[PDB]
C-alpha cells in the first residue's frame, strides 16, 4: 500500500496567478482534487471513503492547499531567477511526495521530489535527511533548505502523519481498496493476410493497474514480436490492457497467453 | 491528509 500526492504549478505571464493543481492517490484510487482556477477553490473529494470525513478535515486540507499555491508561486519566481529565464515564458513546477506501507513495521519508504520544466530538480534522499540536486541551480535550493531544515520538516510528516492517514484511509475503505479485482480475459482473432492472423490477449476490469501480459509459443516466451499497449483506465476505477501477436495461419492453437495479476490465485494460461 | 507547506524554493 502507498499514499502519494502530485502537485503541478504552471505559470502564465500577464494572465494572472499561476495555476496550481493537486491530486491525491491511495494505490491506484484518487480521493482528493484541488484546483486554484476554480470559482470555488476547495479540496474536493473523489472517493466515497473521504466524503464521510467531517467539515474540519476538508477545512484543514483546503487552507493547506491555498498556502501551498502561494508558496509555489514564490518558488516559480525564484526558479526563473535561478535559470535566468525570460519573464514571458511559461514554466511548470511539479512535486511528488508520498509514503509506502508494508504489512508490518510502519512505513516502508518515503519520498518527496520536485521537477522544473519536466526534469529532475531536487529530490529527498531515502534517509529523509539529505537532498540531491540535479544541477547548480538546484544547489541554491539545497543550501536554502539545509539552513531551514526542510528535510526534518518533511520527515516529520512522512514518518508520522503520512502513515497514519494511509492506515486510516485503508481501514475506512478496505472493501474497495484492500480487495483485488481479477482481470476478465479473452482472446480475439483478426486475419491480416492470406496466411497470417493476429491474436489479441485482452484483460479488462482489474485492480490494481499492474498486470503482466505475454504471449508464448510452444511454451517458450515470445517477446520480440508482441505489441503491447500501456495500461488504460476504463473510467470506473478499473483498468484495461491487451497484447497482440502476428501468427501464421494454422499454428494459432499452439500460441498461449499468460496473465499475471494480484487478483488471481495463480497466473492463468489460456489459448484461443 | 496532505503535507504542510515548507520553505520556498
Amino acid at each position, epitope marked *: 500500500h502507498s499514499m502519494r500526492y502530485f502537485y503541478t504549478a504552471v505559470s502564465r505571464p500577464g494572465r494572472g496567478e499561476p495555476r496550481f493543481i493537486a491530486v491525491g492517490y491511495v494505490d491506484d484510487t484518487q480521493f482528493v482534487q484541488f484546483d486554484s482556477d476554480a470559482a470555488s477553490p476547495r479540496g474536493e473529494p473523489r472517493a466515497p471513503w473521504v466524503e464521510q470525513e467531517g467539515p474540519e478535515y476538508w477545512d484543514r486540507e483546503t487552507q493547506k492547499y491555498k498556502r501551498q499555491a502561494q508558496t509555489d508561486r514564490v518558488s516559480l519566481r525564484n526558479l526563473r531567477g535561478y535559470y535566468n529565464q525570460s519573464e514571458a515564458g511559461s514554466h511548470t513546477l511539479q512535486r511528488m511526495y508520498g509514503c509506502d506501507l508494508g504489512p508490518d513495521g510502519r512505513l516502508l519508504r518515503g519520498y518527496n521530489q520536485f521537477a522544473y520544466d519536466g526534469k529532475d530538480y531536487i529530490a529527498l534522499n531515502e534517509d529523509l535527511r539529505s537532498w540531491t540536486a540535479a544541477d547548480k541551480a538546484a544547489q541554491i535550493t539545497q543550501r536554502k533548505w539545509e539552513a531551514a531544515r526542510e528535510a526534518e520538516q518533511r520527515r516529520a510528516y512522512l514518518e508520522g502523519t503520512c502513515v497514519e*492517514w494511509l492506515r486510516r484511509y485503508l481501514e475506512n475503505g478496505k472493501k474497495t481498496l484492500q480487495r483485488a479485482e481479477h482481470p476478465k480475459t479473452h482472446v480475439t482473432h483478426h486475419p491480416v493476410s492470406d496466411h497470417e492472423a493476429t491474436l489479441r490477449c485482452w484483460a479488462l476490469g482489474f485492480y490494481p493497474a499492474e498486470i503482466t501480459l505475454t504471449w508464448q509459443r510452444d511454451g517458450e516466451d515470445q517477446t520480440q514480436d508482441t505489441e503491447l499497449v500501456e495500461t488504460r483506465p476504463a473510467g470506473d476505477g478499473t483498468f484495461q490492457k491487451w497484447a497482440a501477436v502476428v501468427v501464421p495461419s494454422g499454428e494459432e492453437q499452439r500460441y498461449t497467453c499468460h496473465v499475471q495479476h494480484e487478483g488471481l490465485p495463480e497466473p492463468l494460461t489460456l489459448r484461443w | 491528509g496532505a503535507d*504542510g507547506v515548507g520553505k520556498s524554493a
Partner: T-cell receptor
Amino acid sequence: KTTQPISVDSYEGQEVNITCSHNNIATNDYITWYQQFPSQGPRFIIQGYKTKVTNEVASLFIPADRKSSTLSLPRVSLSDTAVYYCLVGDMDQAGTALIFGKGTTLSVSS
Amino acid sequence: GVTQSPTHLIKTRGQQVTLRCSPKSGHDTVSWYQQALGQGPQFIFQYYEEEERQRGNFPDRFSGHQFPNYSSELNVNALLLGDSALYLCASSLGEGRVDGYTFGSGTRLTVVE
C-alpha cells in the same frame, strides 16, 4: 480543544495523575503537556501521539481511541506546584498555532 | 532562551506600548499570547518571514512586526484597563513543531487609570 480538571490536590511523594479530555481529536493532531510556574512562562514537559511516552520528568498515557490523555508524575515534590496545560496541537507545518485551555492548578502538601 | 522586553512596565488608559521579543537561537517563527490573571494564554498572532501568517481574536489595535533577524515587536495602542496581562512570546522553527514551542519569561503589563 481540550478540557481538564480545574485543580488537583496531592501530597509529597505520591504519584499524581492529571486526566485530559479531547474527544474530537483528529489524525493529524499531536498531544503535548506544558508547565507554568508562578511569574514564569510555559515550560515543555512531554509530547506524544498514540503510544506510551516517558521521559526524565513525567509519563504520558494515551488510550487507543486517542480521546483522552493522562499525565503521570511519579514522585511529586514541593517544587512541582505549578499550572499544567494539556494541549492538542496541529501536526501539519504552517498550520494552526498552539492553543491553550483553562489549565489545571496542582497543589502539593507535606 | 527567548528574550522578552521589558520585564515589567506601567501605562495609563489611552496610552500606547511597544513590547519586544527575541526568539531562541535557531528559531524563526514568533507567536504572541496574552495571559490575563486567572486564565490561560490567548493567542494573538504568529509572524513568519516578516509577515502575519495567523491571527486570533484581537482587534486591529494590536499590531505586530518582525525583523529579518526573526526578532519581533508587538505594538498595541489605546490601552484599555482590560489589557493588563502577561504578554508571552513563543518561538518555533518554520511554523512547525519539530523544534517545539519555547516561551519566554513574559512581559508584565499593567495599565492604570
